[PDB]
Amino acid sequence: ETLWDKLDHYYRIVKSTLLLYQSPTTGLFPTKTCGGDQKAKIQDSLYCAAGAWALALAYRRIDDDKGRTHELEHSAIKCMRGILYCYMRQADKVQQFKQDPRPTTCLHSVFNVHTGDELLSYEEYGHLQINAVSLYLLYLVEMISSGLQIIYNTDEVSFIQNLVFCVERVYRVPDFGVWERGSKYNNGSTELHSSSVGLAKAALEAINGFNLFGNQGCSWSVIFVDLDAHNRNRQTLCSLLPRESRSHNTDAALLPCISYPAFALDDEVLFSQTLDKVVRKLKGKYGFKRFLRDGYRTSLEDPNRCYYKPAEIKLFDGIECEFPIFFLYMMIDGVFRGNPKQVQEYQDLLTPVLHHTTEGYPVVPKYYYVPADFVEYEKNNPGSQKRFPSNCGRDGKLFLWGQALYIIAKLLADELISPKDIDPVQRYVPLKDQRNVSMRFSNQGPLENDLVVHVALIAESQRLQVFLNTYGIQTQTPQQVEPIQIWPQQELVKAYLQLGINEKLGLSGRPDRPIGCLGTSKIYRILGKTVVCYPIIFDLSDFYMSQDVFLLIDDIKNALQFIKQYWKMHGRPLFLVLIREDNIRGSRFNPILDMLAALKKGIIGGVKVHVDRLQTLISGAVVEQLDFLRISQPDVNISEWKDKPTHEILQKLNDCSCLASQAILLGILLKREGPNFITKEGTVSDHIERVYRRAGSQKLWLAVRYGAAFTQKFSSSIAPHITTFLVHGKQVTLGAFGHEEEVISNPLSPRVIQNIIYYKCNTHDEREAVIQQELVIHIGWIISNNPELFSGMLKIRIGWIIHAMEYELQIRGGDKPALDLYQLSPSEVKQLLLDILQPQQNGRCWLNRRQIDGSLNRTPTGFYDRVWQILERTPNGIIVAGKHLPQQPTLSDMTMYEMNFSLLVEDTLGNIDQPQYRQIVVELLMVVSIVLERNPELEFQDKVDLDRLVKEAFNEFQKDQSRLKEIEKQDDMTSFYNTPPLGKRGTCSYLTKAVMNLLLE
Amino acid sequence: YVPLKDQRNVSMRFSNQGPLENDLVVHVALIAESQRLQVFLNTYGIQTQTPQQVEPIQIWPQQELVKAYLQLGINEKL
Amino acid sequence: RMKLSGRPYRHMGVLGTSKLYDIRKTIFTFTPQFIDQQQFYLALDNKMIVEMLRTDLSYLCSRWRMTGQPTITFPISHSMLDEDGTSLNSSILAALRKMQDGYFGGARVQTGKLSEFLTTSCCTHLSFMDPG
């Protein structure tokens, strides 16, 4: 038999299965093949189109095809055009989502097939899904690279650009998931999904630098990408890769993202570990289940409650459905990886489960279900019983997506095509070719990092230049580089904003967002003039820590490390550094010489750098082109001066020279009169700005902080810190110690956070805003560069840490009065924070160490699992601080490693007022866990009162102290706190004695 | 150097149909010479087109191409 | 699927029946409509048949905007004989003799056998009649 018979048989299969139910009006397939359903998804139609394209590509190899390929290309083009028309029909939603993303402004994903219009309201389906858009973009670029034509005019280019802009920010907004359910509880909450992030990253890589018009194109078919969004997506994927979600340990949806559709996991060892874990934990006789405890269309499921009630998931286990479609994906992975044995084993496994039509055509049923007479018997013996085929397995109902995957897998197995043909973009490469690819691996190899970064030195003034030259320092004035121009960061942002504007539909272009260091590291050409920019660290900032040279040394070193680690473009990056005459300021001129001499040496902390004339570096280098533009102590107290008249306050302000009194008088005037009042030096706002700038120049820190609080200025980097803290798994709470506090569990817009923190600041204190900002930036920087330092802490509270270093500084002061923290330099504040953050050692009083540990809310490693095992072996429960933790709901709702059980435990334990008491309670709980685990014969007879145990231990310690040191009964347990837990007579001994006393009775 | 599996769409060495295959289809263009001959052929069912009806296209003998190629590759300095 | 009933039934003229047809690798020929006796009695008169035949011949010779020579089949039925049924009518034999010698009505007529006309005649290939 020749190829003709096989291709004809595949043609009959496709005609009788796939293309039979295509809608001529729109060209998109529906979800149901019977009953005249008017609903359609996006995934199934796209998969069918991809299968048709693959079949046409296979059939192309015959010069006498008799037009078979033409029909399939035309059907695929019609489907793509219909989907593009449906997407572009809704235009207001895209613009709304570009500014304030939300489920209300989300793009609709389900619509009627007959007229391409919406049919069902967004309150019953969510409509929030970004995987479909990314997959559509990837398939579209793949088809265009293949040689097909789908884009007609330039408006489609603008629409694609806006779609890329909207999808660039998918790493923060939670999605509804592939299965549309999201959380396992199915209550109506959105969470982050790793598969969506991976698909978005893959599409971002694919769409970068590609001609959308095909064979011909000059300047109106290219797409521009931002490296910062790709970097952030990569970080989020890497952080959230081991676990698909916080509420899902594993899921079968992780397969089409680390396989042929995506091919995004380039880690080998971790990819293999994840594959083994998924195979071990989700393997089934009849296929692969969606996930554990999945009550999806099971026998016990009823069509009367969209949201599952609590504790129903516990009853829903053991009857999970089986989906044999994943066998095709596994076989595709096997043939792609060149492992025939896996292909044979999965083919033999899939052979019996396959069904046949009247003519014997293969059938792939959707899901498998168990009859109601084996509900309980199956629980005792998993998989020993037999299931029953679904409705779409005999006649009248089919599964287009499953059949398309089956025919694709069979075509791949039959060797009718090659992996290169199906992957014209080369998404997957083997280990020996990962040497000179773009955006993925460097030219030095995967397991190598020796990048050399170019550094350019530019002076600021002629006097500063000659002063540096007198010491041997070579710098060039900006007036001697006349052919080259140096622009700030705002110009590039404005130029990017001018791009992507359309008048027919109404387009706002790229949103006004700051550009990262990697973006500024390149060289641009605007209107035929070369444009270079320096990082945002060098520009003047109203804040105060920019005047400390140690902070500048640290941040330039961190920027150099960031450039070294995350640079993959061809060509060496360009770095620009500027030195200002006001920086040296006399005595502060030596360490600048030190850093610059180290830079001239060639190595900066293990990072190699190069210095030369800027013109030499510019010549012979690739320059980015932007061609769109042409086409288009105080003596004044608050209480004393509050009731003074306006004229007296004005006179006092006029005739006073002290900065603090001037600031407090300006604040009183602003609070009483208002910002629009006129004083001797212009408007109130202008006077406040002038005095703030003068304070910054004089660098007296308390007045600068007061003026910054007055100006209501906030840093533009809090959102990355809060989002990386959330993705890490920790929690942050904003507030003041001893006052109200706000807890954040999901990413929020900057406006809401700013309003909340400013309202709190207006409520309690004056300068806590800037102190909190400095603390959060320092903590974020430290956790970014030293993640292991913050191990053991879950809830990060700035106010408690502030109280912590205040107490430590007061202790250090001793007889000398404690120094005010508002007057501390940024270097001193950073040193204090790093000192308190240290794991702590002996020498100092153990009470202070316990206080610091409790303030930081540190928890021992393995505390959560120990608590869970205690709760499993505690028939009654655990009661602390008046809170109750019943065993039945937590056992019937949560699981071993679920994070919400840990959250409930933390909420229960957070009612303790004394942090040292909390630490002692935690140590006692650990001792109880260890003792109970070491011996299973002894079990508790009733609920334990840990307060009673602590009181008994305290009384025993009091008796022992009276016996030894003849000390009378003293109130408070601070003596117990001072005693170390281990030693000759530690706290652990008393806790063990209390434990044995409780167990014996 | 090309492996055996890759030699499928290489120019000037192998055909698209594969190394061990030869099923090329060749196009032929049929053009008449005179109107009388064209109508005589059409009377018997044979369809031919006169050279005067292909005005956008041109038909030239083999000597013109030889002359044009001879024009190429002339240098005056050497 | 699209609720289409195809071409509605309609009468066929001489221009459609003149050409040859191909149905599943076979040669088919259709007689002209005006020799139909199960519709009306207009075909029961010999002189009527003669004049309609002459008019159809003239009309076919007039335009013929197709390619190839036309072909007409004129079988002789039992009703074309005399009362005794032993000889054809005078009008019929006169019509055939006028068809011979290449001049009848207002057109040139050439007679022969279907074997020779096969090599030079318009042929139509029908593909929609093939099995699905």
> In terms of residues, how long is chain A?
1001
Sign of the CA dihedral running A712, A714, A719, A721: negative
Nearest chain C residue to B44 by CA distance is: C120
For residue B69, give how far its alpha carbon lies from the nearest alpha carbon of chain C (Å): 44
Cα A739 off chain centre by: 30
DSSP SS3 for C20: strand
Strand partners, A388: A369
Instruction: Report the candidate in A626, A788, A766, A781 with the shortest Cα–Cα distance to residue A710.
Output: A766
The residue behind tokens 């199956």 is A378
Q: Is B25 on the interface with A (CB under 8 A)?
A: yes
Check CB contact of C68 with chain B, cutoff 8 Å.
yes
Instruction: Identify the CA nearest to A764 among candidates A802, A725, A720, A793.
Output: A802
Is C67 in the B-facing interface, judged by CB distances under 8 Å?
A: yes
How many whole angstroms separate alpha carbon A275 and alpha carbon A257? 12
Tokens 């020779």, located at residue: C116
Q: Can you name the residues that pair with A944 across neighbouring β-strands?
A: A878
Question: What tokens appear for A158 in the block?
Answer: 């603008």
Task: Name A447's Cβ contacts closer than 8 Å, sequence gap at least 6.
Answer: none
Chain A contact set for B5 (CB, 8 A):
418
Amino acid identity at A135? L
Of all residues in chain A, the one with the smallest CA distance to B26 is A63
CA atoms within 13 Å, Cβ hemisphere of A303:
1
**A600 Cβ contact list (under 8 Å, min separation 6):** A473, A611
Chain A residue nearest residue B6, CA to CA: A418
Measured CA to CA, the distance from residue A887 to residue A875 in angstroms comes to 7
* Chain C contact probe: residue of B39, B43, B49 with most C CBs at under 10 A: B43
Smallest Cβ distance to A64: which of B5, B16, B25?
B25
Per DSSP, the residues of A535-580 read -TTSS--SSSGGG-HHHHHHHHHHHHHHHHHT--SSS--EEEEE--
Is residue A436 within 8 Å of residue A154, measured between CB atoms? no
Q: Which residues of A touch B16 (CB under 8 A)?
A: 61, 63
For residue A120, the SS3 value is: coil
d(CA C40, CA A207): 74
**H or E, element range at A608:** strand A607-612
CA distance A541 to A580: 14
Contacts A64 to B, Cβ<8 Å:
23, 25
- For residue A734, the surrounding DSSP H or E stretch is strand A731-735
Residue A971 to residues A366, A859, A955, A989: CA-CA distances in angstroms? 71, 28, 11, 21
Q: Report chain C residues whose CB lies below 8 A from the CB of B40.
A: none
Contacts of A50-55 with CB under 8 Å at 24 or more apart are A50/A139, A50/A404, A50/A408, A51/A18, A51/A404, A51/A405, A51/A407, A51/A408, A52/A14, A52/A18, A52/A19, A52/A76, A53/A143, A53/A146, A53/A148, A54/A408, A54/A411, A54/A417, A54/A422, A55/A10, A55/A14, A55/A407, A55/A411
Cβ pair B42:C67 closer than 8 A: yes
CB proximity under 8 Å: A 48-77 to B? 61, 63-64
Contacts of A222 (CB under 8 A, 6+ apart): A209, A210, A211, A212
Sheet holding C20-22, edge to edge: C27-28, C20-22, C123-125
For chain B, the farthest-separated pair of C-alpha atoms sits apart, in whole angstroms, at 62
Residues paired with A624 in a beta bridge: A524
Under 8 Å between Cβ of C49 and C34 = yes
Minimal CA–CA distance to A855: which of A787, A797, A898?
Answer: A797
Q: Which DSSP symbol is given to A297?
A: S
Sign of the Cα torsion A9, A14, A17, A22 reads negative
Calculate how close chain B gets to C22, using CA atoms only, in Å. 17
Considering only the C-alpha atoms of chain A, give the largest distance between any 2 of them, rounded to a whole number of Å: 108
Q: Give the Cα-Cα-Cα angle A714, A718, A724 (nearest 5 degrees).
A: 180
Give the resolution to one decimal, in Å: 3.4
d(CA A305, CA A185): 13
Q: How far is Cα A78 from Cα A58, in angstroms, rounded to an integer?
A: 20
Residues in chain C: 132
Residues of chain A positioned with their CB less than 8 A from the CB of B25: 63-64
Judged by a CB distance cut-off of 8 A, whether residue C123 touches chain B is: no
Using the CB atoms, write b or e for A507-525: b if 16+ within 10 Å.
Answer: bebbeeeebbbbbbbbbbe
Specify which residues A695 forms β-bridges with. Answer: none
Query: How would you class C62 by CB atoms within 10 Å of its CB: exposed for 0-12, middle for 13-18, buried for 19 or more?
Result: exposed
Q: Which of A107, A91, A122 is nearest to A42 (CA)?
A: A107
Please tell me the distance from the alpha carbon of residue A160 to that of residue B26, in angstroms, as a whole number.
42
CA-wise closest residue to A496 among A338, A694, A672, A632: A632
In angstroms, rounded to a whole number, what is the distance separating the alpha carbons of residues A228 and A169? 11
Q: Report angle CA A989, A994, A1000 to the nearest 5 degrees.
A: 125
Q: Give B20→chain A minimum CA distance, Å.
A: 14
Percentages helix, strand, coil for chain A (3-state, rounded to 5) are 50, 5, 40
Between CA A295 and CA A302, with CA A301 as vertex, the angle to 5 degrees is: 150
Contact B47 C68 (CB under 8 A): no
Residue pointed to by tokens 């059938």:
A363
State the pairing for strand pair A624-625/A524-526. Answer: parallel
* CA–CA distance, A774 with A826 (Å, rounded to integer): 8
The residue among A820, A790, A793 whose CA lies nearest residue A805 is: A820
Q: For chain B, which chains pass the contact test of at least 3 CB pairs under 8 Å?
A: A, C
In contact, C11 and C33? CB cutoff 8 Å: yes
With DSSP H G I counted as helix, E B as strand and the rest as coil, what are the percentages for chain C, rounded to 5? Answer: 35, 10, 55
> Which residue, chain included where needed, has tokens 């014996």?
A1000
Q: Are A212 and A153 in contact (CB under 8 A)?
A: no
Residue C122 Rama label (left phi>0; alpha psi -120 to 50; beta): beta
Residues of A in contact with B17 (CB under 8 A): 61, 63
Q: What is the rounded CA–CA span in Å between residue C80 and residue A715? A: 110
CA distances from A86 to A93, A130, A135 (A): 13, 16, 16
Pairing between strand C123-125 and C27-28? Answer: unpaired
d(CA A359, CA A375): 35
DSSP state of A382: T
Listed residue (A661, A656, A654) closest to A633, CA to CA: A661
**What residues are paired with A733 via a beta bridge?**
A743, A797
Residues 6+ apart with CB under 8 A from A556: A537, A577
| A644 in Cβ contact with A661 (< 8 Å) | no
Task: For residue A89, report the phi and psi dihedrals to the nearest 5 degrees.
Answer: -60, -40
Q: What own/partner pairs with CB < 8 Å and gap ≥ 24 does A426-434 have?
A: A427/A202, A427/A206, A427/A262, A427/A263, A428/A260, A428/A263, A428/A336, A431/A268, A434/A266
Residue A265 is encoded by which pair of tokens? 């996991």
Q: Which residues of B touch C (CB under 8 A)?
A: 42, 44-45, 47
- CA distance to partner chain A, nearest, from residue B68 (Å): 30
Which residues of chain B have a CB within 8 Å of the CB of A63? 16-17, 23-25
How many whole angstroms separate alpha carbon A967 and alpha carbon A120? 78
Q: Are A705 and A767 in contact (CB under 8 A)?
A: yes
Q: With an 8 Å Cβ cutoff, are C68 and B45 in contact?
A: yes
Q: What is the C-alpha separation between C127 and C108, in angstroms, rounded?
A: 34
- Measure Cα distances from A968 to A960, A973, A994 in Å: 11, 13, 22
| Amino acid residing at C34 | F
DSSP symbol at A250: -
